[PDB]
Design a protein around this ligand. Structure first.
Ligand SMILES: [Zn+2]
Lengths: 667, 86, 724, 95, 225, 232
């Protein structure tokens, strides 16, 4: 059951359950105190349920104090599938789980059960809450991203207060130049012309009208209902007249009160834009880098609390009228109708071959669908910016534009079970009647998706086992291995549009570089990146800005592929990802960690996944491409059936037979 | 020599880890002949025996750690003082 | 292909008798192959539901047949169509083979008519599989109804047309899991089949002819027909189902009441006055709350438990044999040896618990005493039997007791005694005795709830009525659903059920929206306009205008674009009503919700997944013999399995000691766990080994074959691992 | 989270070494009585239903307080293992 | 400095509107909600607590000659509303014994010393020819909602405890209406509105409600550590 | 239920901040007491605040003053933060005078003293005067309650005066959290704990007590009945 009042620290679990788990412990504590002479009397007191006295409970909670229990949920895909919490005695018969760790265990509250184990030893207890406590495992070991980040409602709350309005500048209320616009545009505002927040180019009439000295004043004003949280007013926070909203300066103090350092807190937030899972993700990650572990913990619960609390009062539901069909739909479908009618006669005259007609109908609706998709979010963004659907979608709360397009616009082209998409698409959306046929048409691909999800449940840790069998050896046993070897991580990739150069995407470089050890010192931009420091995230971004100006194209970073210490890896060669952000502690069972963090996402690989098998098992491909045994020069032939290429040097040559279908790469 | 995941896995130095696959008689026998030793290198090996994990806490780098209060610390200083005879 | 009757409710068994499996006992299809076997094919149109298949492994394999589909003289599924003569539709129907279907042009059921004519020149029709647009002349057949496309359950979802196929099978499969509720209720917005389901499933009891009612017990009904018959229909009083639910009948007629042929006399288990009553009509407000309806959690008004709506009876069945043994015969008796007088207060003179007594886990249900094991020792004891007053042997306690988990109050007993009067008692079985125990099981935090549209959810919080959203008049809502469950799951049908349910709540009426011949938006709107002149037309007259809070919300409302400004609050609130939404005030501050919120009546039901079967907690207890890991028993549960992946978890942390505990002191290593618990009662810390059980056993068990396995020191040296 | 964990992770070369130190300190802080402590004059961990953590609720938490001050020494091979145990029992009673 | 006019409007025992006017900006909420929240919970009253039927030994029974099972009779018994006319009675055991062809109303209980059944036409059960219903229900006084499973009240060994909905307050609504009065526009006409079963009048409940609140403010009496 | 008399513990630190915990309360009274008290603390608590200002030669709120570093807006913003206390309930309003010249940091003490007025805020930074800078000003302090914007009250002293937003309420912020606490067999009891911030005029405790006293006195208003009934 969701436990929103629990600290990330904590979990709730029923009374009768806690009493039985710690029963041998409890017997002792009733023997500590005057509750029982000895255990043989302590046993008899606890048999039947109606007897447990008030003082007995006091002893139970007293036994619990500080101790943690382990919680588990069914498919234990990565290590964060087991986390430790303190138990909290709760009414009821369910375990209560903190919402921020419904991320780690793939858990939603629709019947899922969980396991609960007691650790017995002071040892077992220590490692449970030095290493396994949830409020310490904030960043995933797979990617350095944070994993205990704001979920469904937390995001939807914090975005609904950290947002701004716009309104009817029916007349071009220019204040930038006129001082007659100071009072007399407010004249018109305190008349029936201009709204409190509109473009006046430098200010909105709200900016001028209300100007608060405290933030304490600003919300005291909001409390008295003269301005809302997402109106724009002038406030003076930290020696600057800020034109902003009370909601977004409220958000600021929320972060600023969680972590005691108002000054850092200001500096690592971006209150010039609304808050969405990405910005909050970065905020959580920035906070853990700069401020420590436990402060980020207090930050997360705090975000969870105002996120929840503002979510309910803000009042956002889903009525049927909140899925607004743009006027653009009937227009685009009329075009689409006509242009499909053009295709019909062009084929009926003999100008379009029976194939070229088909390709051209699909081309039509694929364009028609994408056009009305952007035509929906155009409506939302220009006319109803606070529409719940649109808010949930563009916040991290809930919604894929792929999904929204099916409620408001239309479900597009369905597929046959074979793979050929149908000619007639689904013209309807869900907000209006989906026809009988359009629904039976849709179900063909509906089950092919349900089936593909079923055929990945079948063997859950299948990938993970085989990687565990290969890697369980691997530990961190040495501080370093003396090896002066390394790997050069390339920052560009040659042949894509041509045989040229191109910056690898941001995530990729980032994934290959975040938290490694330099192999060599690298002086780039008045920066000597000394050999053998753990290059951080900012570090990695600098090398991207560096190779963006073309100053380098590779990096020397020490790697496991070039580690030397035998039966595991050394600290330096491995990267810089414990669950924390700090360097690898000796004894980190990186082996299983690497397996899980590769195997867990394997549950999201469609059937892709067989490719992944095909790489991990050295195996022959399907459409295998010949490599050149010799570094030489290309020459091709035009033989009627079957061409070929010679790769030739000044010394010797080699011909490679090429089937007729085989399209080449090198000119 | 490049080998796939399962092949690389199914061919280990240790026989304890090897006995966890599908033909155990072959590897038990092959090792029983040559009097093979099984260094408790990896995890899987060391879990078949009921013996402690060679990682985390069970890393020999950390296993042997000592802690002393400053009151009993100077109380060992006096374990070497009575070592002078007469 | 034989399996227990899935009879959780009437609909549950009807769905079950009408399943279709691919995994034949002769070896037709096996668990390995799936890809094209499971897909829906064009021929399933009208013949096999594209929805009914269950989640997980058995997708596409087990799928129920369509509503109108039936099997002809040979094993072929055959859907109906009706012929159209040129452009004139007939009242004459032809069930057609799947192959025979493909010979013709079949038009779609949503095709306009004028008595018998097609109307639109531009017609929707299917040839063999393809979607074809056609003219009225070409049309050769037409469908009978959109219901013939899906199964019986899928055909109880009212606005399926607005529901994603994926979460639609979740609605279909859950109605199976609907548990019969004592205060059961038909949906506020139906589809039409809900009186036909309780007919064809024989849940209920209907008059055989026209006549009058002569007697009505809670036990039996008696009626006087025209033909002169006077028939006695005895009721099924409190019968247990195969999976625990209570299936009883309730008489719904009075003595002296005339009846018509086919009229209803008694409701089945989940039948409200002739309608399928799988759940109840709650007043739902769909809005977030203080992290209490997170992902798919649910929040509940305590008014439900007071009104006892979400209560459902359940009856368990406990059974013991008085078997006959080498030691001597066992005896169902009351004088058990080592029992306190307090532990026997509820057992009758024979040892059976008395009817109507609350039994708690550990009490006696039927007392049984068996002779002391290890045998009848003839050499010496046989003399003692003649020496000492014969039958003065020793007898122990082997009674039957309410297991961990619980029971209720005893409601019925069954003795099948020797002198066997029509019973097949097994060899050595002397008698058998059964006791039925029952429980009124109210809704509790942890139980599972769902609508017809596929909205899974566990009750996460039971708020008191005081502090939860209410309307201007002091009426609170009953259920709080999180709107974040709507957009991912494309199932807007539940949203329409809410709006239409909102109008039906102030109009005092229920609705039937046929599956694809449903309620259109204008119809719904004008019923809501009809509603608001009652929700608020009256509040003007009672002397109350708009609330200062209502206008504060209409302020932000027009800023949000939900009312058109310049109108009066009344005309705006009606604009705002028609959109399903209303001004709602947080019950704990009295301050209005700052935007309008849609509320209404939604049909929600209680699933078979309650929390009595579900919670377990094990400290210590029994342990198996060949494997020493533990198991449940007298007053102890079993452990949870700590699997291989859960070992990879602890390995991925540094939980070396925690993991070894899981494998040593928890259940497997005898010396270890004994030292572990004795040292807990001490107040000590638990020591790990010693040596581990698995390690010593694997030595000697290898040692059983002629393998010399030694253990060695750091330098190669012998280490004795057997503790002297 | 837990009070000053960031400071404790910094105390040790190995994340896991903190754990063993905490655990082994907790063990002695239970075994040779509870008066083994280095910090018990004024403000040391407390509880509710009275204020009563000054004798014996959570030994591992204690160890984390104690290690949070420079009073304790941790390291690979500090003192011979065997006179370690002989000198602890010999110095403190409660047995 | 205002002195708000407290007008009262009564409609029998059931409904009562209590108007307080004119109030300071936004006190309609400040006074009319914490009283709402108190009226709903902490107002005391009466409710049926346990039942015993002739020959019936558990709640899951059927009574010959009676249409309704023992469960439906209990569900019908929760609606029984009973005024105690003397604030010294903690419990009254009502007796009902009827036979023959009859629709047994709550009327048909035998009269008690100082007890008023506010619910005379409440339908208890439908008895046919020769149907015998003989029973003893007990009403206690209490506060709030208390299930049968918490209290477990039984007079006799065959009794069946019934859930207890004591609070005699059906619904409660307050209306904050704008009242110009004199100088100011933004004044609140707090008029709050109360429905009740007759055991206690709406006024009776409101007065106990403000008195529960008053008494809760006195808990900030003396500070401590 | 009586002998569970709730313990009212108080942490107090000076005169700005104070946490007040009240426990254990019957299910759902934490909100029933904490929100009606916060709504009282924020509005109906009485006090003083600057309501109108007049500057030497300044004719609009937006101008810039030669020889003065601060814009006319930040001076009025500094004046909104001025906290003052009347010591005799016969002062209905005080017009404070400030006249200073030359290079100086004019503090809130640089207002000239007045007979029954205590500036709680003597070190407040009012303005920074540059070389040849002349500052001559009269600000108007009135008694009031709550927060009142400039265009609502429209206070006038001189024809050049500029009305200022009024922060009367000597309460800066108020927040309460209602926590579950356990007494024996029940977990679901309410632990009402509320924070109060104030400007120094009154301590947090004095504000809370004035607040409960307003509420108490408002309950006494259901004591003078009348007669009517509605139907149509
Ligand atoms: Zn290395």
């Amino acid at each position: 059951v969701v436990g929103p009042q629990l600290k990330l620290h904590q979990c709730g679990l029923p009374k009768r359950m806690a009493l039985e788990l710690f029963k041998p412990f409890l017997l002792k504590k009733m023997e500590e105190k005057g509750i029982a002479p000895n255990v043989k009397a302590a046993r008899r007191m606890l048999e039947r349920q109606r007897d447990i006295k008030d003082e007995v409970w006091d002893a139970l909670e007293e036994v619990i104090h500080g101790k943690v229990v382990l919680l588990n949920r069914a498919p234990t895909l990565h290590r964060l599938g087991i986390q430790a919490f303190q138990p909290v005695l709760v009414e009821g018969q369910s375990i209560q789980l903190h919402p921020l760790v419904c991320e780690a265990f793939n858990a939603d509250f629709d019947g899922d059960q969980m396991a609960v184990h007691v650790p017995l030893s002071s040892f077992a207890q220590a490692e449970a809450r030095i290493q396994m406590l949830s409020a310490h495992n904030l960043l995933s070991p797979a990617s350095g991203e944070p994993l205990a980040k704001p979920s469904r409602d937390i995001i939807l709350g914090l975005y609904y207060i950290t947002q701004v309005r716009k309104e009817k500048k029916g007349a071009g209320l220019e204040f930038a130049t006129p001082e007659e616009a100071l009072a007399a545009h407010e004249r018109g505002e305190v008349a029936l012309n201009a709204p409190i927040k509109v473009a006046g180019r430098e200010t909105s009439v709200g900016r001028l009208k209300y100007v608060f000295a405290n933030p304490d004043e600003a919300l005291l004003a909001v409390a008295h209902g003269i301005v809302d949280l997402q109106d724009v007013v002038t406030v003076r926070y930290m020696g600057k007249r800020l034109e902003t909203s009370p909601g977004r300066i409220l958000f600021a103090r929320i972060v600023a009160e969680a972590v005691e350092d108002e000054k850092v807190a200001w500096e690592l937030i971006q209150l010039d834009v609304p808050q969405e899972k990405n910005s909050l993700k970065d905020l959580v990650y920035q906070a853990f880098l700069r401020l420590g572990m436990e402060k980020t913990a207090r930050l997360l619960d705090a975000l969870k609390y105002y996120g929840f609390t503002f979510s309910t009062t803000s009042g956002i539901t889903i009525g049927i009228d909140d899925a607004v069909i743009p006027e653009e739909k009937k227009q685009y479908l009329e075009e689409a109708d006509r242009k499909l009618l053009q295709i019909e006669q062009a084929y009926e005259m003999g100008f379009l071959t029976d194939r070229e007609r088909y390709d051209q109908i699909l081309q039509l609706w694929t364009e028609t669908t994408e056009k009305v998709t952007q035509a929906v979010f155009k409506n939302f963004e220009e006319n109803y910016p606070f529409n719940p659907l649109y808010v949930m979608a563009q916040s991290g709360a809930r919604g894929n534009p792929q999904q929204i397009r099916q409620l408001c616009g239309l479900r597009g082209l369905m597929q046959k079970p074979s793979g050929e998409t149908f000619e007639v698409p689904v013209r309807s959306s869900f907000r209006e009647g989906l026809t009988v046929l359009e629904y039976f048409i849709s179900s063909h691909g509906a089950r092919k998706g349900g089936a593909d999800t079923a055929l990945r449940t079948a063997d859950s840790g299948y990938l993970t086992r085989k990687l565990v069998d290969v890697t369980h050896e691997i530990v961190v046993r040495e501080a370093d291995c003396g090896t002066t070897n390394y790997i050069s991580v390339p920052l560009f990739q040659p042949d894509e549009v041509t045989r040229s150069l191109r910056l690898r995407k941001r995530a990729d470089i980032e994934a290959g570089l975040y938290g490694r050890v330099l192999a060599r010192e690298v002086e780039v931009l008045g920066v000597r990146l000394e050999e053998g420091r753990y290059l951080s995230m900012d570090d990695v971004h600098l090398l991207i800005k560096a190779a963006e100006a073309g100053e380098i194209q590779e990096v020397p970073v020490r790697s496991p592929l070039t580690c030397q210490t035998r039966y595991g890896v050394c600290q330096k060669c491995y990267g810089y990802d414990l669950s924390m952000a700090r360097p690898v502690s000796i004894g980190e069972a990186v082996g299983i960690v690497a397996a899980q963090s590769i195997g867990e996402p394997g549950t999201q690989l469609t059937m892709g996944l067989p490719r992944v098998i095909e790489l991990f098992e050295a195996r022959r491909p399907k459409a295998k491409a010949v490599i050149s045994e010799i570094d030489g020069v290309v020459r091709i032939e035009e033989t009627e059936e079957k061409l070929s290429v010679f790769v030739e040097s000044e010394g010797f040559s080699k011909e490679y037979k090429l089937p007729k279908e085989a399209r080449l790469l090198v000119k | 020599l490049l080998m796939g995941v399962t092949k690389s896995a199914l061919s280990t130095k240790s026989w304890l880890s090897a006995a966890s696959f599908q033909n155990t008689t072959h590897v038990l026998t092959e090792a029983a002949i040559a009097g093979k030793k099984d260094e408790l290198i990896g995890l899987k090996e060391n879990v078949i025996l009921g013996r402690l994990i060679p990682a985390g806490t069970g890393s020999d780098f950390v296993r042997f750690t000592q802690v002393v209060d400053q009151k009993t610390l100077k109380a060992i200083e006096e374990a070497r003082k009575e070592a002078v005879e007469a | 292909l034989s399996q227990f009757k899935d009879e959780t409710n009437p609909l549950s068994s009807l769905r079950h008798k009408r399943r279709i499996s691919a995994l034949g006992p002769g070896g037709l299809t096996r668990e390995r192959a799936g890809f094209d076997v499971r897909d829906v094919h064009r021929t399933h149109y009208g013949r096999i539901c594209p929805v009914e298949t269950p989640e997980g492994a058995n997708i596409g394999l087990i799928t129920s047949l369509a509503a109108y589909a039936r099997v002809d003289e040979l094993g072929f599924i055959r859907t109906p169509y009706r012929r159209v003569v040129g452009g004139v539709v007939t009242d004459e129907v032809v069930y057609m083979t799947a192959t025979e279907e493909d010979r013709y042009t079949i038009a779609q059921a949503n095709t306009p008519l004028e008595g018998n004519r097609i109307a639109a020149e531009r017609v929707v029709a299917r040839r063999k599989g393809e979607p074809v647009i056609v003219s009225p002349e070409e049309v050769e057949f037409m469908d009978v109804s959109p219901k013939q496309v899906f199964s019986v359950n899928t055909n109880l979802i009212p606005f399926l047309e607005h529901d994603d196929a994926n979460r639609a099978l979740m609605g279909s499969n859950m109605q199976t899991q609907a548990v019969p509720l004592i205060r059961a209720q038909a949906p506020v917005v139906m589809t039409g089949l809900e009186e036909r389901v309780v007919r064809d499933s024989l849940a209920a009891l209907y008059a055989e002819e026209d006549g009058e009612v002569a007697k009505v017990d809670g036990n039996r009904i008696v009626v006087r027909y025209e033909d002169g018959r006077l028939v006695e229909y005895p009721l099924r009083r409190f019968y247990r189902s195969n999976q625990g639910t209570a299936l009883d009948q309730r008489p719904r007629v009075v003595v002296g009441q005339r009846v018509r042929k086919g009229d209803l006399l008694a409701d089945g288990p989940a039948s409200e006055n002739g309608f399928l009553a799988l759940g109840q009509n709650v007043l739902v407000a769909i809005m977030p709350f203080d992290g209490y309806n997170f992902e798919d959690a649910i929040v509940i008004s305590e008014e439900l438990l007071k009104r006892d709506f979400y209560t459902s009876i359940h009856i368990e069945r406990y059974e013991i044999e008085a078997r006959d043994t080498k030691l001597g015969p066992e005896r169902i008796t009351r004088d058990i040896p080592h029992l306190s007088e307090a532990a026997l207060r509820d057992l009758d003179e024979e040892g059976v618990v008395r009817i109507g007594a609350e039994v708690k886990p550990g009490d006696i249900l039927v007392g049984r005493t068996s002779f002391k094991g290890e045998s009848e020792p003839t050499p010496e004891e046989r003399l003692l039997r003649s020496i000492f007053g014969e039958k003065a042997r020793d007898v122990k306690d082997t009674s039957l007791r309410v297991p961990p988990g619980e029971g209720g109050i005893v409601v019925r007993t069954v003795r099948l005694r020797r002198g066997d009067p029509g019973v097949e008692l097994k060899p050595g079985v002397r008698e058998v005795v059964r006791v039925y125990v029952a429980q009124k099981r109210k809704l509790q935090v942890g139980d599972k709830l769902a609508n017809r549209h596929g909205n899974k959810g566990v009750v996460a919080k039971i708020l008191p009525v005081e502090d939860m959203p209410h309307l201007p008049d002091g009426t609170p809502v009953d259920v709080i659903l999180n709107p974040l469950g709507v957009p991912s799951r494309m199932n807007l049908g539940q949203i329409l059920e809410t709006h239409l349910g909102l109008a039906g709540y102030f109009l005092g009426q229920r609705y039937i929206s046929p599956i694809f011949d449903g309620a259109k938006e204008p119809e719904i709107k004008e019923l809501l306009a009809q509603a608001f002149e009652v929700y608020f037309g009256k509040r003007k007259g009672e002397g109350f205008g708009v609330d200062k809070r209502e206008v504060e919300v209409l302020r932000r409302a027009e800023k949000l674009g939900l009312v058109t400004p310049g109108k009066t609050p009344e005309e705006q609130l009606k604009e705002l009503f028609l959109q399903g939404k209303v001004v709602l005030y947080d019950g704990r501050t009295g301050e209005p919700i700052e935007g309008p919120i849609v509320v209404g009546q939604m049909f929600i039901m209680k699933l078979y997944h309650m929390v009595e079967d579900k919670m377990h907690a094990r400290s210590t207890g029994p342990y198996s013999l060949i494997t020493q890991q533990p198991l449940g028993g007298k007053a102890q549960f079993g452990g949870q399995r700590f699997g291989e992946m859960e070992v990879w978890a602890l390995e991925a942390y540094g939980a070396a000691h925690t993991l070894q505990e899981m494998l040593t002191l928890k259940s497997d290593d005898i010396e270890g766990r004994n030292a572990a618990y004795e040292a807990i009662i001490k107040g000590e810390d638990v020591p790990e080994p010693s040596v581990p059980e698995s390690f010593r056993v694997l030595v000697k068990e290898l040692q059983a074959l002629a393998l010399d396995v030694q253990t060695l020191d750091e330098k190669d040296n012998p280490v004795d691992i057997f503790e002297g | 989270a837990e009070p000053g964990i960031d400071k404790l992770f910094g105390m040790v070369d190995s994340k896991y070494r903190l754990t063993v130190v905490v655990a082994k300190r907790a063990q002695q802080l239970l075994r040779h009585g509870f008066k083994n402590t280095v910090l018990e004059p004024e403000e040391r961990p407390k509880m509710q239903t009275l204020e009563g953590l000054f004798d014996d609720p959570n030994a591992v938490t204690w160890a984390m307080k104690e290690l949070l001050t420079g009073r304790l020494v941790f390291g690979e091979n500090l003192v011979p293992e065997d006179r370690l145990q002989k000198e602890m029992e010999r110095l403190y009673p409660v047995e | 400095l205002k002195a708000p006019v407290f007008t009262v409007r009564t409609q029998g025992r059931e409904y009562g509107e209590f108007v307080l006017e004119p109030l300071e900006r936004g006190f309609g909420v400040t006074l009319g909600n914490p009283l709402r929240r108190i009226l709903l919970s902490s107002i005391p009253g009466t409710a049926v607590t346990s039942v015993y039927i002739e020959d019936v030994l558990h709640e899951f029974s059927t009574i010959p000659g009676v249409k309704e099972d023992v469960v439906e009779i209990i569900l019908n018994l929760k609606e029984l509303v009973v005024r105690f006319l003397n604030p010294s009675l903690q419990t009254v055991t009502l007796l009902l014994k009827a036979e023959g062809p009859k629709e047994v109303k709550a009327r048909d209980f035998l009269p008690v010393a100082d007890v008023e059944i506010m619910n005379p036409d409440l339908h208890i059960a439908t008895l046919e020819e020769g149907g015998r219903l003989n029973m003893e229900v007990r009403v206690d006084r209490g506060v709030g909602y208390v299930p049968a499973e918490k209290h477990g009240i039984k007079d006799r060994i065959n009794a069946i405890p019934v859930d207890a909905v004591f609070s005699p307050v059906r619904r409660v609504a307050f209306q904050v209406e704008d009242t110009r009065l004199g100088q100011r526009t933004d004044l609140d006409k707090l008029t709050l509105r109360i429905w009740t079963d007759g055991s206690v009048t709406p006024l009776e409940a409101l007065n106990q409600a403000v008195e529960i609140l008053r008494e809760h403010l006195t808990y900030f009496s003396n500070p401590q550590a």
